[PDB]
């Protein structure tokens, strides 16, 4: 596997969507990534680019599916 770390452009896209979804790395996405990728991920910067692209796909699905309830 390519272990190239996540780049800043992909990170910014992820962050934009987390903010839009009212979700966070600490509460929501890092726990989920840790479960999905079956490794201890403690900071956003520790994702690989390949992992981040999967997470970004998932967040686009969430943001496109439905409105974020108040």
């Amino acid at each position: 596997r390519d272990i190239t770390p996540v780049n800043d452009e992909t990170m910014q896209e992820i962050n934009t969507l987390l903010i839009a979804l009212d979700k966070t790395w600490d509460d929501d996405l890092l726990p989920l990534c840790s479960q999905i990728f079956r490794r201890d991920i403690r900071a956003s910067s520790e994702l690989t680019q390949a992992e981040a692209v999967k997470a970004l796909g998932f967040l686009k699905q969430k943001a496109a599916e439905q409105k974020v309830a108040a």
Partner: peptide, 10 residues
Amino acid sequence: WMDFDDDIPF
């Protein structure tokens, strides 16, 4: 394995 292709709540 649950993965990001799956329909997980978030």
